[PDB]
Design a protein around this motif. Structure first.
Motif, short mmCIF file in Angstrom:
data_model
loop_
_atom_site.label_atom_id
_atom_site.label_comp_id
_atom_site.label_asym_id
_atom_site.label_seq_id
_atom_site.Cartn_x
_atom_site.Cartn_y
_atom_site.Cartn_z
N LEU A 23 0.83 -1.20 0.00
CA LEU A 23 0.00 0.00 0.00
C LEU A 23 0.87 1.26 0.00
CD1 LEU A 23 -2.75 -1.07 2.60
CD2 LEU A 23 -2.72 -1.43 0.12
N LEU A 24 1.93 1.24 0.81
CA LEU A 24 2.89 2.34 0.84
C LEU A 24 3.54 2.53 -0.52
CD1 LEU A 24 4.57 1.99 4.35
CD2 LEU A 24 2.82 3.60 3.57
N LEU A 25 3.71 1.44 -1.26
CA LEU A 25 4.22 1.50 -2.62
C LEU A 25 3.18 2.07 -3.57
CD1 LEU A 25 6.61 -0.13 -1.52
CD2 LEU A 25 6.40 -1.65 -3.49
N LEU A 26 1.91 1.79 -3.30
CA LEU A 26 0.82 2.30 -4.12
C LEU A 26 0.59 3.79 -3.89
CD1 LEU A 26 -1.95 -0.46 -4.19
CD2 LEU A 26 -0.28 0.15 -5.94
N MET A 27 1.05 4.30 -2.75
CA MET A 27 0.90 5.72 -2.44
C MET A 27 1.82 6.61 -3.28
SD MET A 27 0.22 5.95 1.65
CE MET A 27 -0.13 7.69 1.38
N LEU A 28 2.74 5.98 -4.01
CA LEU A 28 3.63 6.71 -4.90
C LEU A 28 2.84 7.39 -6.02
CD1 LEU A 28 6.67 4.28 -5.28
CD2 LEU A 28 6.45 6.28 -3.80
N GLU A 29 1.81 6.71 -6.50
CA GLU A 29 0.95 7.24 -7.55
C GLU A 29 0.12 8.41 -7.02
OE1 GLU A 29 1.07 6.02 -10.70
OE2 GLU A 29 2.59 4.56 -10.08
N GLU A 30 0.12 9.51 -7.77
CA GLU A 30 -0.65 10.69 -7.39
C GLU A 30 -2.15 10.42 -7.42
OE1 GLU A 30 1.61 13.85 -5.94
OE2 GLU A 30 -0.55 13.76 -6.32
N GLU A 31 -2.58 9.72 -8.47
CA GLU A 31 -3.99 9.40 -8.66
C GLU A 31 -4.51 8.46 -7.57
OE1 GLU A 31 -4.54 7.39 -12.35
OE2 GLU A 31 -2.81 6.06 -12.07
N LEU A 32 -3.66 7.55 -7.13
CA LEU A 32 -4.08 6.53 -6.18
C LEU A 32 -3.94 6.97 -4.73
CD1 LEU A 32 -2.52 3.34 -7.87
CD2 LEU A 32 -4.84 4.24 -8.10
N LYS A 33 -3.27 8.09 -4.49
CA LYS A 33 -2.93 8.52 -3.13
C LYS A 33 -4.16 8.79 -2.26
CE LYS A 33 -1.09 12.52 -2.36
NZ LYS A 33 -0.13 13.65 -2.45
N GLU A 34 -5.06 9.64 -2.74
CA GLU A 34 -6.28 9.96 -2.00
C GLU A 34 -7.16 8.73 -1.82
OE1 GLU A 34 -8.31 13.15 -3.92
OE2 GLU A 34 -6.74 14.63 -3.54
N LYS A 35 -7.08 7.81 -2.78
CA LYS A 35 -7.86 6.58 -2.74
C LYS A 35 -7.36 5.64 -1.64
CE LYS A 35 -8.93 4.85 -6.74
NZ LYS A 35 -8.81 4.22 -8.08
N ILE A 36 -6.05 5.45 -1.59
CA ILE A 36 -5.43 4.61 -0.57
C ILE A 36 -5.65 5.23 0.81
CG2 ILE A 36 -3.29 3.59 0.28
CD1 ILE A 36 -4.33 2.40 -2.33
N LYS A 37 -5.51 6.55 0.89
CA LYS A 37 -5.78 7.28 2.13
C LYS A 37 -7.21 7.00 2.59
CE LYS A 37 -6.14 11.67 1.73
NZ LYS A 37 -7.62 11.63 1.92
N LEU A 38 -8.14 7.15 1.66
CA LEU A 38 -9.55 6.87 1.91
C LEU A 38 -9.75 5.43 2.38
CD1 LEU A 38 -12.52 8.11 -0.19
CD2 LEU A 38 -12.42 5.68 0.37
N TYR A 39 -8.93 4.51 1.87
CA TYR A 39 -9.00 3.12 2.30
C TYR A 39 -8.54 2.98 3.74
CZ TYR A 39 -7.57 -1.69 3.11
OH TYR A 39 -7.37 -2.93 3.66
N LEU A 40 -7.51 3.73 4.10
CA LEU A 40 -6.89 3.61 5.42
C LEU A 40 -7.74 4.24 6.51
CD1 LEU A 40 -3.07 4.14 4.80
CD2 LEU A 40 -4.37 2.02 5.08
N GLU A 41 -7.91 5.56 6.47
CA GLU A 41 -8.56 6.24 7.59
C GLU A 41 -10.09 6.15 7.54
OE1 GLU A 41 -9.69 8.11 5.24
OE2 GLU A 41 -8.53 9.94 4.91
N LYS A 42 -10.63 5.59 6.47
CA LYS A 42 -12.08 5.46 6.36
C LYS A 42 -12.59 4.07 5.99
CE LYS A 42 -14.71 7.33 7.57
NZ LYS A 42 -13.78 7.47 8.73
N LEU A 43 -12.24 3.61 4.79
CA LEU A 43 -12.85 2.41 4.20
C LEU A 43 -12.87 1.22 5.16
CD1 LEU A 43 -12.45 1.27 0.54
CD2 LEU A 43 -12.45 -0.45 2.34
N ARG A 44 -11.81 1.03 5.94
CA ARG A 44 -11.95 0.06 7.01
C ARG A 44 -12.17 0.79 8.33
NH1 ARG A 44 -5.59 -2.01 7.54
NH2 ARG A 44 -4.85 0.01 8.33
N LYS A 45 -13.45 0.98 8.65
CA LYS A 45 -13.95 1.18 9.99
C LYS A 45 -15.37 0.64 9.98
CE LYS A 45 -13.87 5.36 11.44
NZ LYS A 45 -12.68 5.26 12.33
#
Length: 367
Positions: A315-337
């Motif tokens: 996931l930290l590797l996927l955060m390199l992509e600008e397009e995917l960054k907000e998405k992965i963030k959304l997965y972390l602090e939101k999508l899993r709760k």
RNA sequence: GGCCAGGUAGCUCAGUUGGUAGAGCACUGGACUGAAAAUCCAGGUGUCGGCGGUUCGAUUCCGCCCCUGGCCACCA
């Protein structure tokens, strides 16, 4: 008690090296190194026997190890090589001036800093300085060490030291040195928090090209390293309870464009963690298709599917992509709760169908 | 100290898309006997290291520790 026992034995012991440095740097460490004029083994044996702890003799090395509380003590006899040797002789054989000092534990002079080579000044002026010209030639591993130190303490190499360093690598001494010592040096390096800076010194003096076979520097990898730095900053900021080893990521980025053979060979020599090999082998092939899949992602549930099985590294590797960054963030602090109450879950249970159903309910909640 | 395995009954050993556990010999109990063993029926063969965490659910994912063995650096 140390100065007392040393008093009784007619000996002189001193705190020595890195420890002293760290003390002067206001860093507290549980590993203390002593240098004894006279038999160090007896000193250690007596000390351990008086505190009533186990002791670990090494008569061939002339050194002994004993643990008091959280303190780890290593006693070592003074020697002139890698007739009794003077302290000064034992200090002259070390790498850099900031590592070349000692502090007396003897009861009369106790608290007195012993500095022969002006390590205090070099510490004061932030200087990484070899003791003699021949230094890097003797132990090529120092080449990395200096850089490492210069990175952590944010010191600079003296002109002498820098010239001698460049000359040391120019003679290709980096390849001649024992592979194990070097590899271990790097393993030390990647555990630094300032390790990025160290990599900067690595790129500056071009040492990586010698150790790693097929490794070359470009801009893309560098910018990738900095983006990785920012991602690491944010991740270790908000999610800090979830932290893993970050240096390995930088290593992965370095070896990313390398051939998979030399890559697996390198991770083999480096004795990298399992999740590091997994993340690397996953990065080498699957990562592209995974990114392309994340690009086609519409519903949140599909994202959950493509992400959740993966480790934090990927996931930290996927955060390199600008397009995917907000998405992965959304997965972390939101999508899993989430959770579900008693009666509801009880009704969900009314085999694998329980899991499938729970998944259907989660995908019912998400979208 | 870093890493790699190995951690499964009393001993010797396998088990991956997370979903309700196995072999060979000892254990109890009875049928069997004058007693014992063999053998038959069977059925204990187990918090699949320890502790937390993620998950509806962890032998499995991850983190920190425990033990053994092997490769490795072992002062800086």
């Amino acid at each position: 008690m140390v100065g007392q026992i040393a008093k009784e034995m007619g000996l002189r012991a001193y705190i020595v090296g890195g420890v002293v440095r760290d003390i002067l740097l206001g860093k507290e460490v549980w590993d203390v190194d002593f240098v004894v004029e006279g038999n160090a083994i007896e000193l250690a044996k007596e000390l351990a026997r008086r505190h009533g702890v186990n002791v670990h003799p090494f008569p061939e090395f002339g050194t002994a190890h004993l643990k008091i509380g959280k303190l780890k003590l290593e006693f070592a006899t003074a020697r002139r090589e890698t007739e009794p040797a003077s302290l000064k002789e034992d200090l002259i054989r070390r790498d850099f001036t900031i590592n070349a000092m000692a502090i007396s534990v003897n009861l009369e002079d106790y608290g007195t800093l012993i500095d022969y080579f002006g390590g205090l000044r070099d510490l004061k002026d932030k200087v990484i300085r070899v003791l003699h010209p021949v230094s890097f030639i003797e132990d090529p591993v120092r080449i990395l060490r200096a850089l490492r130190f210069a990175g952590r303490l944010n010191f600079k190499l003296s002109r002498s030291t820098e010239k001698l360093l460049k000359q040391a690598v120019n003679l290709g001494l980096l390849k001649e040195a024992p592979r194990g010592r070097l590899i271990n040096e790097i393993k030390l390096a990647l555990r630094e928090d300032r390790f990025l800076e160290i990599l900067e010194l690595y790129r500056k003096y071009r040492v990586l090209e010698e150790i790693i076979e097929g490794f070359q520097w470009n801009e893309k990898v560098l910018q990738k390293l900095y983006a990785l730095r920012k991602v690491v900053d944010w991740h270790a900021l908000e999610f800090s309870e979830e932290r893993i080893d970050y240096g390995w990521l930088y290593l992965l980025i370095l070896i990313s464009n390398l051939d998979y053979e030399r890559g697996k060979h390198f991770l083999e020599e480096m004795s990298a963690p399992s999740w590091v090999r997994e993340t690397y082998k996953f990065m080498k092939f699957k990562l592209g298709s995974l990114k392309e899949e994340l690009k086609k992602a519409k519903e949140n549930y599909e994202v959950y599917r493509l992400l959740k099985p993966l480790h934090t590294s990927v996931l930290l590797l996927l955060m390199l992509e600008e397009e995917l960054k907000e998405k992965i963030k959304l997965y972390l602090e939101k999508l899993r709760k989430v959770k579900l109450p008693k009666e509801k879950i009880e009704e969900l249970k009314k085999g694998k169908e329980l899991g499938e159903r729970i998944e259907e309910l989660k995908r019912e909640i998400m979208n």
